[PDB]
């Protein structure tokens, strides 16, 4: 999309891998501000906001909390206390075209700057002047979008630059967006620290006879001690002995 | 159908404070980029600063830190507050409407500033008298720039010759205005050197004649 | 910074032929270049921007080409009022920078200049000073030499000019040449006498007056 | 605020009859109003405090009466000195108001104005302007017409008029019209003339001067 | 081989800031004791302030509070910057290179401080003509001190004889400068008093003639 037009994707009800952008050699700017980037695939948000959009290689710097410029105060505005990462890369070789790529559009003129996450896609005649301005274009009269013209030949800077902000929002809706939970293989007749499915404890995982019905995961006895529970990976049934203890 | 006046020009001391402003009438300041463009005298084109149309402020690495661009949105009035003003800062500064940061539309006509410890002084008038027949006067021994010099309040404009001032050894300035007129109308016509000086408040009327 | 060179520093060209003013980039800006023309005394008025859009208003000889880091900025023809210093802004980084200026003048036929002599007045005198003004009316070329004669003997470093810009409508210039002295020193002499010497004379004018008289 | 209202807003009246001034409060003050007397260029003096007491050194003649919105100031006999402007104030209120003033003035037998004519000292002739000034010395009534002649042409809207507040010994007025020029416009006319228009007079008075005596 | 040339004096507004400079040649400001020293006209000698060799400041207990002496190292000069001055601080302060806080082994000029609610006022300047010979002007109605009267530009120098400035009634200064001179050299050699007052920019060279 344009920047004026900015397009917004709503990431939720997903498990997001971080680190596979995080270790992308093709994004030349990866700025995370209010979260470490490592820790990303760890911390667990209500959603995410994907905004999307093309700009020049040198207004990459206003897409910052707390930057002012053209694509700051009209275009896309980030809140001064903005958590997430703003990710962009060039894209000339897609975004420029040899007869000019007038398909990309930023907004010039507005009477006042725009507030932090607000879309402005109003295309009507500008009254610069505040002469009777009835609609018509012309004098003190000025369309407010001005086209970024691209060719592959420009320099850097003057380039396309496509950019995707992300913005990690927790609002205390339960949280669906987290990262890839990490897993090991499975160890058995050992006695091993075990942690299925955030149920921890020390024993040995050894096979069951127990059927547990499909809806149903770990498996207590009488005094309420988790003596039965069900691979998540592969759907079996383990007992869990207690580790061997005794008196000398 | 524009036009852009300027007022609140003259001598400041090094290290003074001064406030330009910019009267707008064919459009509104509050809604356009508006931006302070330099010009020393001999030396070419410099920009100093731009409020954008939402107002956001732009300044010259040269220059930040000292000056200040803002608007007054009910009457079309933009204003430059200048501080700890320099040597380097005597100029004449224009207001201009730019479409964006870009290009400049529109210009004021521009306000001198001149930095200096200097005084200022009132100007001397003489008259150059003729023997066509050519007749001036000499305006000498003033500071600063700007003196205005008109002919029978403006009615007298062909012919008219206003020399560029010169700076003296003493440090002041001198130019002479001259006129090229028949000798027919030598004893009918009288001419009247309309010299005004606004840093002095001057305002000399001073008839020449052979 | 941009770093934005003009050529030729001056041109001087007759009414009619083709006025190319070159402006060199130090970065490549795409094509975010304007071009505005300033007369003397008045403020700058945009000529083109975006390198080639003439603004409304502004007549047809003025065209404008090149891209990246080489701009050029043609008249066709040139008329009297071009005389001007003309400028090219960049726009496309984020300090406005402008180009030095390039001042065009104009060729003419050359015209001889209309001296005239003008005596210190008595209230001048009585202030302690004295100036003796010769003026140099309606000439082309500029190049024109003044010599300060005071009982034939030639003065040296006490006489300031002063030249106008080239005049929009007939193309000549004007010179005023003030003599500067001290009263006692001006009371001294008698005879007082600017030698002029031009192209378009063919031997120097002299134009003298008397103290007395 | 409360709004003080005068009236009349001028009286004038013969020496030793009733002047009556009424001032009027836009809400009512009980008995919390003062009367002041200003004579030009002196400050104001209390005549009256709690709108009928007089302050020590009033005189007798000095009376006040009225309550709730209406108030009265009384002067029984006027004298020559009574010529003044007579101001009243509020003090019921939190804002102090003063009225608009009552401008009273005394009547007088006609007398026929003095009239004396200035020509244009030659120093300010060497300063670039000419004033000639005409002067009407005690007179009375106020209203009085002077005309500019200049070689018999009337003149129109380059003269300005002062007139002198009323005498307190002798009840008359001054006035004095000058007549502003340039220089040269000075110099091109021979004779100068002042008419003088009066109720005192029968006849407008002439007082002229030429230039060159 | 050193000089110590001082800068900044004239009027002040009674309760006003003037900041007094004084640059140095054959040594550094910055690795010397430093002090201003008051001398009012007429009084003696009157210690206002000093700058250590590394950087501490004292000051007089009648000036505390009121008066800052600084240094700027780059280019050796010291600065003393006065604030609400009282009429009792017109004095000729002079900068001393001291041996410690001590004893003051090299001096400066002097600048002359003036605290008064009167206005500059320009120099009237009269001929005293000759019937030896003796000749001279006289400078009368200005404010404040000082006039500097020179004979030819300091070619005259034998016999001139600048006489102190006597307060008048009215308030301002008169002197008179006389020079005793041949009468063979009357009609050969002409006199020239240029007098200055920096105060007011008066630069008045006046021809002195029988
Ligand atoms: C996980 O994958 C294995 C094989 O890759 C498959 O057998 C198992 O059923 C999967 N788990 C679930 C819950 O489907």
């Not at chain 1, 470490?36 to 959603?47: M, Q, V, W, Y």
């Amino acid at each position: 999309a344009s920047v004026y037009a900015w397009n917004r994707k709503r990431i939720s009800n997903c498990v997001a891998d971080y680190s596979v952008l995080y270790n992308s050699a093709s994004f030349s700017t990866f700025k995370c501000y209010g979260v470490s980037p490592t820790k990303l695939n760890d911390l667990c948000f209500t959603n995410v906001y994907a905004d999307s959009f093309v700009i020049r290689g040198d207004e990459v710097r206003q897409i910052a909390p707390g930057q002012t410029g053209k694509i700051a105060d009209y275009n896309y505005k980030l809140p001064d206390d903005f958590t997430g990462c703003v990710i962009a890369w060039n894209s000339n070789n897609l975004d420029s075209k040899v007869g000019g790529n007038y398909n990309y559009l930023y907004r010039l003129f507005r009477k006042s700057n725009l507030k932090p996450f607000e879309r402005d896609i109003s295309t009507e005649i500008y009254q610069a002047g505040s002469t009777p301005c009835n609609g018509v274009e012309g004098f003190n009269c000025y369309f407010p979008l001005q086209s970024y013209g691209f060719q592959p030949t420009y320099g850097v800077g003057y380039q396309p630059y496509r950019v995707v902000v992300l913005s990690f929002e927790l609002l205390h809706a339960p949280a669906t967006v987290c990262g890839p939970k990490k897993s090991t293989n499975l160890v058995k007749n050992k006695c091993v620290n075990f942690n299925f499915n955030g149920l921890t404890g020390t024993g040995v995982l050894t096979e069951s006879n127990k059927k547990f019905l499909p809806f149903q995961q770990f498996g207590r006895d009488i005094a309420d001690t988790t003596d039965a529970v069900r691979d998540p990976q592969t759907l079996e049934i383990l007992d869990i002995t207690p580790c061997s203890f005794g008196g000398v | 159908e524009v036009q852009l006046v300027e007022s609140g020009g003259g001598l400041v001391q090094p290290g003074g404070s001064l406030r330009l402003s910019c009267a707008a009438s064919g459009f509104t300041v509050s809604s356009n980029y508006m931006s302070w463009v330099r010009q020393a005298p001999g030396k070419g084109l410099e920009w100093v600063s731009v409020i954008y149309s939402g107002g956001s402020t732009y300044y010259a690495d040269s220059v930040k830190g000292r000056f200040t661009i803002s608007r007054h949105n009910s009457k079309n009035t933009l204003y430059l507050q200048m501080n700890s003003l320099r040597a380097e800062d005597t100029a004449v500064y224009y207001c201009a409407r730019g479409y964006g940061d870009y290009y400049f539309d529109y210009w004021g006509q521009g306000t001198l500033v001149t930095v200096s410890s200097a005084s200022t002084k009132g100007p001397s008038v003489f008259p150059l008298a003729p023997s066509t027949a050519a007749l001036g006067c000499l305006v000498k021994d003033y500071f600063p720039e700007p003196v205005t010099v008109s002919w029978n309040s403006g009615a007298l404009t062909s012919g008219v010759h206003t020399f560029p001032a010169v700076l003296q050894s003493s440090g002041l300035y001198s130019l002479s205005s001259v006129v090229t007129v028949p000798s027919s109308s030598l004893g009918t016509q009288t001419y009247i050197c309309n010299v005004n000086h606004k840093p002095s408040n001057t305002k000399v009327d001073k008839k020449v004649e052979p | 910074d941009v770093v934005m060179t003009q050529s030729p520093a001056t041109l001087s060209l007759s009414p009619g032929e083709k006025a190319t003013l070159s402006c060199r980039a130090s970065q490549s800006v795409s094509s975010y270049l304007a071009w505005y023309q300033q007369k003397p005394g008045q403020p700058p008025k945009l000529l083109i921007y975006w390198a080639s859009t003439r603004e409304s208003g502004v007549p047809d000889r003025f065209s404008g080409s090149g891209s990246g880091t080489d701009f050029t900025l043609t008249i066709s023809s040139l008329q009297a009022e071009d005389v001007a210093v003309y400028y090219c802004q960049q726009y496309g980084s984020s300090p406005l920078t402008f180009g030095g200026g390039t001042k065009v003048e104009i060729k003419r036929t050359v015209a001889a200049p209309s001296v005239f002599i003008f005596p210190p007045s008595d209230e001048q005198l009585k202030s302690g000073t004295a100036s003796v003004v010769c003026l140099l009316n309606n000439f082309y070329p500029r190049e024109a030499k003044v010599q300060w004669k005071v009982d034939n003997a030639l003065q040296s470093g006490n006489s300031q000019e002063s030249v106008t810009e080239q005049d929009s409508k007939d193309s000549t210039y004007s010179l005023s040449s003030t003599l500067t002295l001290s009263k006692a020193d001006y009371e001294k002499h008698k005879v007082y006498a600017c030698e002029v010497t031009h192209q378009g004379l063919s031997s120097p004018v002299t134009k003298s007056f008397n103290r007395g008289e």
